[PDB]
């Protein structure tokens, strides 16, 4: 029981590393999303005054 | 902001509480021991050890050694009684 409880952290360590770095980088690169979102809002405002 | 890291934190985490306590007990109990019936040490002959390896062996240890001892005792006692009575 000790053997098959321990025998899990062999091929999952790389998955944990890659998921950690990917999730952290995706969370912290939200600056691009914020810039695109504000550009979209301002373009929408310009189009809005256009149809107004 | 870092996520939890279970498989990355296993240095301090052991297998429950009892399994890690008994791991040290069971790892060395099977290390320094005879493989299979090594060192029988059957050979012994020092009168007392001669009895040990001749009749007092534990493989049978029946009443035959006891009967032989009783026969020797009564044989000596016959001469003792002849001397005394």
Swiss-Prot record, chain A:
Give the free-text miscellaneous remark of the entry: Present with 12900 molecules/cell in log phase SD medium.
What the record says about family reads:
Belongs to the eukaryotic ATPase B chain family.
Record protein name field = ATP synthase subunit 4, mitochondrial
Self-association state and partner proteins as the record states: F-type ATPases have 2 components, CF(1) - the catalytic core - and CF(0) - the membrane proton channel. In yeast, the dimeric form of ATP synthase consists of 17 polypeptides: alpha, beta, gamma, delta, epsilon, 4 (B), 5 (OSCP), 6 (A), 8, 9 (C), d, E (Tim11), f, g, h, i/j and k.
Described function: Mitochondrial membrane ATP synthase (F(1)F(0) ATP synthase or Complex V) produces ATP from ADP in the presence of a proton gradient across the membrane which is generated by electron transport complexes of the respiratory chain. F-type ATPases consist of two structural domains, F(1) - containing the extramembraneous catalytic core, and F(0) - containing the membrane proton channel, linked together by a central stalk and a peripheral stalk. During catalysis, ATP synthesis in the catalytic domain of F(1) is coupled via a rotary mechanism of the central stalk subunits to proton translocation.
The organism encoding this protein is Saccharomyces cerevisiae (strain ATCC 204508 / S288c) (Baker's yeast)
- For the modification Phosphoserine, the affected residues are 5
Tell me where in or outside the cell this protein is found: Mitochondrion; Mitochondrion inner membrane
Give the source lineage, highest ranks first: Eukaryota, Fungi, Dikarya, Ascomycota, Saccharomycotina
From Swiss-Prot, chain B:
Residues in coiled coil: none
Q: GO BP, one example?
A: proton motive force-driven ATP synthesis
Q: Which UniProt keywords apply?
A: ATP synthesis, CF(0), Hydrogen ion transport, Ion transport, Membrane, Mitochondrion, Mitochondrion inner membrane, Transit peptide, Transport
Task: Tell me where it mainly resides.
Answer: mitochondrion
Q: What else is known?
A: Present with 14600 molecules/cell in log phase SD medium.
What is this protein's function per UniProt? Mitochondrial membrane ATP synthase (F(1)F(0) ATP synthase or Complex V) produces ATP from ADP in the presence of a proton gradient across the membrane which is generated by electron transport complexes of the respiratory chain. F-type ATPases consist of two structural domains, F(1) - containing the extramembraneous catalytic core and F(0) - containing the membrane proton channel, linked together by a central stalk and a peripheral stalk. During catalysis, ATP synthesis in the catalytic domain of F(1) is coupled via a rotary mechanism of the central stalk subunits to proton translocation.
The subunit field of the Swiss-Prot or TrEMBL record says: F-type ATPases have 2 components, CF(1) - the catalytic core - and CF(0) - the membrane proton channel. In yeast, the dimeric form of ATP synthase consists of 17 polypeptides: alpha, beta, gamma, delta, epsilon, 4 (B), 5 (OSCP), 6 (A), 8, 9 (C), d, E (Tim11), f, g, h, i/j and k.
The record's similarity note reads: Belongs to the ATPase F chain family.
Q: What is this protein called?
A: ATP synthase subunit f, mitochondrial
Q: Which residues of the full protein are shown?
A: 7 to 91 of 101
């Amino acid at each position: 029981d000790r053997i098959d409880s321990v025998s899990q952290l062999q091929n999952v360590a790389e998955t944990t590393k890659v998921l950690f770095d990917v999730s952290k980088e995706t969370v912290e690169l939200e600056s691009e999303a914020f810039e695109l979102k504000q550009k979209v809002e301002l373009a929408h405002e310009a189009k809005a005054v256009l149809d107004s | 902001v870092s996520t939890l890291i279970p498989p990355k934190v296993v240095s301090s985490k052991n297998i429950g509480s009892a399994p890690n306590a008994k791991r040290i007990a069971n790892v060395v109990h099977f290390y320094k021991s005879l493989p299979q019936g090594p060192a029988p040490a059957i050979k012994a002959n020092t009168r007392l050890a001669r009895y040990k390896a001749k009749y007092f062996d534990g493989d049978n240890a029946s009443g035959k050694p006891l009967w032989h001892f009783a026969l020797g005792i009564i044989a000596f006692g016959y001469s003792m009684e002849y001397y005394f009575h």
